[PDB]
Design a protein around this ligand. Structure first.
Ligand SMILES: Cc1cc2nc3c(=O)[nH]c(=O)nc-3n(C[C@H](O)[C@H](O)[C@H](O)COP(=O)(O)O)c2cc1C
Ligand code: SF4
Ligand code: SF4
Ligand code: SF4
Ligand code: SF4
Ligand code: SF4
Ligand code: FES
Ligand code: FES
Lengths: 456, 78, 80, 112, 91, 216, 114, 209
């Protein structure tokens, strides 16, 4: 039952390293657009049947099972609006640690195209928009060449593969905002305003893009769709645990000797992730300070328990933490964690859209406290206080950028408190003592500036 | 107001006249002096106003830098 | 009390204090009820006018009102 | 700590005492209110001399000392003034209040 | 009439109410003024009269004080005036 | 930071004219047709980008003109291009140093890369060279995280860098000849282990045409 | 004792016309009219204290956030007419001019305790 | 045609599909807020009207949560009082010390709700401190002092919807968001002195007064 080390023909993607080329005949003997005709003429509910017993959880970071996400879109009077229904593929990512989405579209644009049509048939969608990050210029050129050879082959368009079924893929490029990776801010950026999230009880599956019903699902989880439609749901369900089932791209980066991205089964021990396919850790297993599974937005696992841990949703959320997108940024012991988490808080301050007041006023205060804690101008209670003001942001926002910005600070305070107090006493008798707010008592406000303090 | 914590006795006259009303004042002098020395001996440290700034004002150290305290100072006086 | 036009207020010779000969200018009463105020007002023998209040008309609001589908001309661009 | 928490037991005592007094004079005591360590009997105007007599003379009450009596007008009521009476029992170390009402024209009977 | 309600229905410490569905309408007529108060004093038991209205021994409750003060007259030479003066120390 | 408020010195005027080169107007009429004919306004995000391809930057004439083109007040496009990072509004040189400084780059020596850039020039992270050839900007995660220290110039990424190697690359670009189209100087392909390849040990992919499910 | 409107270092009137001393005064002695001056700064056009209805509670000095009006310890200013005893803005600025050396000594010992 | 629910033990009937804030106003329950208004669209910016709702994991915004049957709403939850103090302290961190010079002294919504719902003291005492916003000359009728703005969008929603003057807006991200014309453009409309009664703080105020 030792989860790990899948074969090669049980892999979903075969171009993830580019030995086979990305073109259309490369995709034909890759094994795709092979029986498109028959699955589009299969029923929408049979597609949703198969996706439901697949156990296909969400791979955007939320983890929501997309069988029930795709069956939320059709209440039994859906034809009673009789207009255009849209699909949105979140091919944006900028989450630190992650490149697996670039790994899809640079290598494999074509089964993305396929899975877009196959999911649009599953949801009776009229068209589909691909939202690639505007930073990804060559990746957008890759995808437009591939979907135009899909137009040339007659595989999508007016009548997709001779099926009587409408389908248009358009590609929209979002000019550098990370909050637009969220569903509803994505919906708003595609309608052409500033990409701010809306509130949830207008659900997008009911009321969405252009005022028309819409889903936003990740580029991976629909690039996996035609494979698991072909292989069947229980061959996918064999991998992983009971509710945690199947495969995942893992991008392991940071301070590994060998940074690389894997395609590996879920529910796998972290030690035989980092040593099996990554060389090892830079300095061995005792040179592990901490580890971030997923992107920027989940807490640290300390070294004590991340030997025992599996990489599913279950064994990470009982470890108070998330799988996210399964980027794994390990921390060198010779590196500083509070410098890293100051960098994370600066990322959240720069990437916050600024709409609701607790997130926007919270990220600035988190940065102002984390610089002060990095050099050490603090009292030992203020770390206490820092915990309090992550509890303030935690559940009071529009989107999930607020609790995204809450979590790494919480993991730092839970796992590396003596690490912070060592730096603070280092400050306390390299320099004189400090008041609350970083003030020293020679520190005064003269003309303009503040003098007396080195002002972090 | 901390008369529990302070030990003293009470003068009470017997005939209802002006003389015993004089004597009990001349003794309440003594008892008040007893309070004064017991209260100078037993004086503690701590705050002298009530703790919150919604019924009496913040100190001027605080209301010149704290936004909340300037709001409370402005409202307790208007 | 309604103001007297000669006795209401005038500015002083000296410093410019607001001087007044009307003495009911600062008195103002509170009552729980409208019929309380009327009963007290004609019980004291006073000429009164009564002003009826004006409440707001109830209109149903949805947050999903903000982005409903345009079939013809948009005729509006929301911001949020 | 809440300052009202030190009163509670005595406040319960006060409740019981007042429930007795209303049961002893049902003809004359319209109501009572206990706020916090303070008892108020709500009594009608022609009912004031039989109640005060009781409060002076019952061995349980013995409210000997008159303290302070005054009026408060509520102009929104039919009976405009309410007349409050404060009594001290220096025996049992206890205070009581007696509230009646009066219009501008109609009297209250005097306890002089 | 709420004291009649406390005499006839009971208390939250002492509920003399079964029939919760019918106990609401048993509440209701006293809330309308069905019963009167001296009728409630006549209807009510003798050990409810001696339990809730009176003391458990049948005595009237004494006028309550918060903190009772027990006096102690100081009369020796710890007093403030020696004997022969018409004023006494009471402590 | 985001800097919003517009100064009207000169070279950013509503007085200054602007319009599309006919190639870009060809592209613009193609771009607007991707969206429903009601919601024309939805196409202002690419069209400003098209203006950013024509001019060196996004002026106020570009934003005013695309507000003219697409049934919009100009404050609605002022919001759109102020909310986004990639709409550079003040003029830059030719190459736009975008060095990533977030934790996967920071743990892998992005600071060595950035000071290897700003020892070469003498410019700070908002500053331009006064040759107006290079403009440094420290930037958040550019989506190349396993390619662990990296940067961007205009559209091409440059990865797996060494401070020995980036002074090499920028003396390449100050000579006019572009160094590599490739992502680094040739230690791996895209995402390889630098060892070699542990996974995908074949010369022909497995077809999934026989591994099919029985239900079709 | 008597009242004084202080000034900043390098001479500026300190009274930003916030009306707090007027709002708190238990005997309604303060009257102020305030206008925006030519600089765009907020100052009093008119400041006035009736010293016949002043009660010396010090609330006007406790209330001011800028600490613009204070009480000088002068009690020796007894007058012969009521008109002399109505202090406008100019008499109080002259007082805050005159007593400023002394008010330094007062507020060096009072300002922590305030 | 109507829906009956429970707020604070009170039972209230309201027309279907309305806002929970309208249910609370009908039941007499006072809920504090900063970016809701009767004559304007609904936004969930200010995060002040958070409320305890049975069958909901998080406190929901009472101004954009629609009315459903069988609803049990609590406003006096310890979680709700904690949430109101949290969001108030978050609002007060970058709001400048201008109460003696602000024109809304006894008429500030922020200030009267800070007594009733907010924290006693303040923990904002950094050396770096609050941000500062550039003053923006709009026109001769509206004085504009935008350090004390709370970004309630209310002026922008109004001049979008009702006045028909789309020149207002919100330009930026994070704390560098500003509320004004981006070019320093003068605002005309036939009712432009109505935005200054609308702003809850004194950021837009009266120029001759
Ligand atoms: C600030 C924020 C940023 C996000 N960025 C991304 C992203 O870059 N790529 C992605 O796939 N999901 C992202 N998400 C999650 C999206 O909402 C995601 O599209 C959705 O929740 C789930 O889609 P799924 O069904 O494929 O999981 C983000 C969420 C938030 C709150
Ligand atoms: S959480 Fe922050 S970035 Fe997200 S919508 Fe709210 S204010 Fe904007
Ligand atoms: S003296 Fe002080 S309280 Fe009076 S108006 Fe001037 S600043 Fe305000
Ligand atoms: S001392 Fe008291 S009465 Fe005199 S002006 Fe000041 S506040 Fe008013
Ligand atoms: S708007 Fe702000 S600065 Fe002005 S009075 Fe109100 S709280 Fe003070
Ligand atoms: S300008 Fe005023 S009304 Fe508009 S968002 Fe700012 S504070 Fe609110
Ligand atoms: S973190 Fe440097 S680009 Fe991904
Ligand atoms: S008013 Fe409901 S959140 Fe702003």
């Amino acid at each position: 039952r030792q989860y790990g080390g899948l074969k090669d023909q049980d892999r979903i993607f075969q171009n993830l390293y580019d030995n086979y080329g990305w073109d259309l005949a490369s995709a034909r003997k890759q094994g795709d657009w092979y029986k498109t005709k028959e699955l589009i003429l299969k029923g929408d509910t049979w597609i949703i049947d198969e996706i439901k017993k697949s156990g296909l959880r969400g791979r955007g970071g939320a983890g929501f099972p997309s069988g029930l996400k795709w069956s939320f879109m059709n209440p039994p009077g859906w034809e009673k609006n009789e207009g255009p229904r849209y699909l949105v593929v979140n091919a944006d990512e900028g989450e630190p640690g992650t490149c697996k989405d670039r790994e899809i579209m640079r290598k494999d644009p074509h089964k993305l195209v396929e899975g877009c049509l196959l999911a649009g048939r599953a949801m009776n969608a009229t068209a589909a928009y691909i939202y690639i990050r505007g930073e990804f210029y060559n990746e957008a050129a890759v995808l437009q060449t591939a979907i135009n050879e899909a137009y040339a082959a007659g595989l999508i368009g007016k009548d997709a593969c001779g099926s009587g079924y409408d389908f248009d893929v358009y590609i929209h490029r979002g000019m550098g905002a990370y909050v637009c990776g969220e569903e509803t801010s994505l919906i708003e950026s595609l309608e052409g305003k500033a990409g701010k999230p809306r509130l949830k009880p207008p659900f997008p599956a009911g009321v969405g893009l252009f005022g028309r019903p819409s889903t936003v699902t990740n580029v991976e989880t629909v690039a996996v769709a035609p494979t698991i439609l072909r292989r069947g749901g229980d061959w996918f369900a064999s991998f992983g645990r009971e509710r945690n089932s199947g495969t995942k791209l893992f991008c392991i980066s940071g301070n590994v000797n060998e940074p690389c991205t894997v395609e590996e089964e879920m529910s796998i021990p972290l030690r035989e992730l980092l040593e099996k396919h990554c060389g090892g850790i830079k300095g061995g297993w005792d040179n592990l300070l901490g580890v971030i599974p997923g992107g920027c937005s989940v807490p640290i696992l300390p070294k004590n328990i991340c030997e025992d841990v599996l990489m599913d949703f279950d064994a990470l959320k009982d470890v108070q933490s998330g799988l996210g997108t399964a980027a794994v940024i390990v921390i060198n012991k010779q590196q500083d964690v509070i410098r890293a988490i100051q960098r994370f808080a600066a990322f959240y301050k720069h990437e916050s859209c600024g709409q609701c007041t607790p997130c926007r006023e919270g990220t600035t205060w988190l940065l102002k406290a984390m610089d002060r804690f990095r050099t050490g101008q603090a009292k030992e209670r203020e770390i206490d206080m820092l915990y309090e003001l992550t509890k303030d942001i935690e559940g009071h926002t529009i989107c999930a950028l607020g609790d995204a910005a809450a979590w790494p600070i919480q993991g730092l305070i839970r796992n590396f408190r003596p690490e912070m107090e060592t730096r603070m006493k280092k400050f306390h008798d390299e320099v004189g003592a400090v008041s609350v707010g970083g003030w020293m008592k020679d520190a005064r406000v003269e003309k303009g500036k503040v003098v007396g303090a080195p002002l972090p | 107001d901390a008369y529990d914590k302070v030990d003293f006795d009470v003068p009470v006259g017997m005939n209802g006249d002006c003389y015993d009303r004089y004597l009990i004042r001349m003794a309440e002098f003594r008892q008040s002096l007893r309070i004064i020395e017991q209260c100078c001996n037993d004086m503690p440290a701590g705050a002298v106003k009530v703790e919150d700034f919604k019924i009496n004002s913040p100190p001027r150290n605080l209301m010149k830098e704290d936004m909340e305290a300037l709001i409370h100072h402005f409202l307790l006086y208007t | 009390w309604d103001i007297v036009d000669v006795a209401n207020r005038w500015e002083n010779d000296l410093i410019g204090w607001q001087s007044s000969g009307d003495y009911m200018q600062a008195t103002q009463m509170k009552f729980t009820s409208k019929e309380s105020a009327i009963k007290f007002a004609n019980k004291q023998g006073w000429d009164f006018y009564i002003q009826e209040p004006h409440h707001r008309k109830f209109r149903v609001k949805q947050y999903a009102n903000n982005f409903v589908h345009s079939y013809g001309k948009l005729k509006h661009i929301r911001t949020k | 700590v809440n300052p009202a928490d030190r009163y509670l037991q005595h406040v319960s005592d006060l409740h019981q005492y007042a429930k007795y007094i209303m049961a002893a004079l049902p003809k004359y005591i319209q109501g009572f209110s206990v706020w916090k360590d303070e008892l108020t009997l709500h009594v009608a105007p022609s009912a004031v001399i039989p109640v005060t007599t009781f409060l002076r003379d019952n061995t349980s009450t013995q409210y000997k000392s008159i303290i302070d009596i005054t009026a408060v007008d509520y102009p929104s009521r039919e009976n405009r003034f309410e007349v409050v009476y404060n009594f001290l029992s220096v025996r049992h170390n206890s205070r009581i209040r007696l509230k009646t009402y009066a219009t501008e024209v109609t009297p209250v009977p005097s306890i002089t | 009439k709420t004291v009649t309600g406390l005499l006839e229905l009971g208390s939250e410490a002492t509920p003399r109410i079964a029939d919760g569905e019918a106990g609401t309408k048993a509440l209701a007529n006293i809330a309308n003024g069905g019963v009167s108060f001296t009728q409630a004093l006549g209807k009510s038991s003798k050990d409810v009269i001696y339990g809730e209205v009176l003391t458990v021994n049948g005595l009237p409750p004494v006028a309550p004080t918060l903190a009772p003060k027990q006096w102690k007259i100081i009369e020796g030479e710890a007093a403030i005036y020696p004997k022969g003066y018409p004023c006494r120390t009471f402590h | 930071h985001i800097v919003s408020v517009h100064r009207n010195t000169e070279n950013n005027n509503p007085s200054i004219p602007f319009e599309f080169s006919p190639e870009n107007m060809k592209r613009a009429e193609e771009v607007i047709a991707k969206y429903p004919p009601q919601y024309k306004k939805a196409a202002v995000m690419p069209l400003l980008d098209i203006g950013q391809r024509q001019l060196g930057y996004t002026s106020i004439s570009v934003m005013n003109y695309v507000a003219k083109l697409l049934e919009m007040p100009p404050m609605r496009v002022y919001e759109v291009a102020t909310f986004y990072t990639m709409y550079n509004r003040t003029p830059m040189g030719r190459y736009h140093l975008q060095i990533c400084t977030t934790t996967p780059c920071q743990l892998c020596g992005s600071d060595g890369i950035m000071e290897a850039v700003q020892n070469t020039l003498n410019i700070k992270p908002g500053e331009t060279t006064k040759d107006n050839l290079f403009t440094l900007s420290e930037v958040e995660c550019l989506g190349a995280c396993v390619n662990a220290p990296m940067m961007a110039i205009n559209d091409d990424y440059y990865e797996d860098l060494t401070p020995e190697g980036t002074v090499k690359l920028l003396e390449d670009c100050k000579a006019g000849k572009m160094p590599t189209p490739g992502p680094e100087n040739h230690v791996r392909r895209d995402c390889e282990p630098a060892s070699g390849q542990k996974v995908l040990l074949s010369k022909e992919p497995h077809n999934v045409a026989d591994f099919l499910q029985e239900g079709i | 004792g008597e009242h004084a409107l202080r000034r900043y270092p390098s001479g500026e009137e300190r009274c930003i016309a916030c009306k707090l001393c007027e709002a708190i005064c238990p005997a309604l002695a303060i009257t102020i009219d305030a206008e925006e001056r030519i600089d765009g700064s907020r100052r009093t056009t008119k400041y006035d204290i009736d010293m016949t209805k002043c009660i010396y509670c010090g609330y006007c000095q406790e209330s001011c956030p800028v600490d613009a009006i204070v009480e000088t310890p002068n009690v020796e200013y007894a007058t012969e007419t009521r008109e002399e005893l109505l202090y406008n803005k100019e008499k109080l600025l002259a007082n805050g001019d005159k007593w400023e050396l002394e008010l330094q000594y007062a507020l060096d010992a009072d300002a922590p305790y305030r | 045609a109507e829906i009956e629910l429970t707020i604070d033990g009170h039972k209230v009937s309201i027309e279907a599909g309305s806002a929970l804030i309208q249910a609370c106003e009908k039941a007499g329950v006072t809920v504090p807020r900063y970016c809701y208004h009767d004559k304007l669209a609904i936004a969930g910016n200010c995060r002040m009207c958070l409320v305890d709702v049975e069958r909901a994991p998080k406190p929901v915004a009472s101004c954009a949560y629609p009315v459903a049957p069988g609803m049990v709403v609590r406003t006096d939850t310890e979680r709700v009082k904690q949430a109101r103090e949290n969001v108030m302290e978050m609002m007060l961190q970058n709001h400048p010390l201008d109460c003696p010079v602000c024109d809304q002294g006894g008429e500030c919504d922020l200030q009267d709700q800070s007594m009733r719902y907010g924290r006693d003291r303040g923990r904002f005492t950094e050396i770096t401190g609050k941000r500062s916003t550039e003053d923006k000359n709009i026109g001769p009728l509206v004085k504009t002092s935008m350090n004390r703005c709370i970004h309630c969008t209310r002026c922008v929603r109004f001049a979008n919807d009702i006045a028909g003057a789309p020149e207002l807006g919100s330009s930026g991200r994070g704390n560098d968001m500003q509320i004004g014309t981006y070019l320093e453009k003068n605002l005309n409309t036939e009712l432009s002195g109505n935005v200054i009664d609308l702003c809850p703080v004194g950021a837009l105020t009266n120029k001759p007064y």
